[PDB]
Design a protein around this ligand. Sequence first.
Ligand SMILES: Nc1nc2ccccc2[nH]1
Ligand SMILES: [Ca+2]
Length: 223
Amino acid sequence: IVGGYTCGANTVPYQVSLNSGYHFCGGSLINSQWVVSAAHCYKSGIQVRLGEDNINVVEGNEQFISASKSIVHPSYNSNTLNNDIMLIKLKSAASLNSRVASISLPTSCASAGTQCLISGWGNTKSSGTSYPDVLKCLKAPILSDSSCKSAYPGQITSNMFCAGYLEGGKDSCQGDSGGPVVCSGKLQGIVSWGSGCAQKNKPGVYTKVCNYVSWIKQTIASN
Ligand SMILES: Nc1nc2ccccc2[nH]1
Ligand SMILES: [Ca+2]
């Protein structure tokens, strides 16, 4: 997260860290046994880490659970990143409390102008790499489809939306991939892609979760 602030320990209880010997992507807990992340974060050997703040120190509240299966959307296109969403089933259920909790899926999509909270342990520098130890937060608005399409002509599908600042300076970045974009208490986006991080007129692009709720429900119901 570039231009964000320190969230504060366990203030984002649905945030998870996907770990394979190091943190490589974020995700959101949507129930005690399932996590939603981005398809491009797929790999085998994933350990899901819940209740984290400093990812390099066991401070208490952490729950490390192995993933039993990862289900990448069948229509995910790695060249266009269309349908960039994945569900991860945990080997055992997580214990939910105030520090570890799930986030609700939306019932309707959000409108441009909606202010959302984006969080993660990704890079904090636009020109260079500095990975933080603790969780960073950024409040950002959803942009209109015209501004998004004008920023990324020919690359935005109906399953994506832009959020951020056109002046640059604040944005998600590598390492934040798969993490949450929450607006009014509902998970509306998943950190997917962008051109660089925090560059002027190149806002971040997110997977539009409201378009996948029935898919998520049906898939969880059958697995
Ligand atoms: N804004 C933005 N978000 C990103 C997520 C992964 C890689 C680069 C990115 N740029
Ligand atoms: Ca920790």
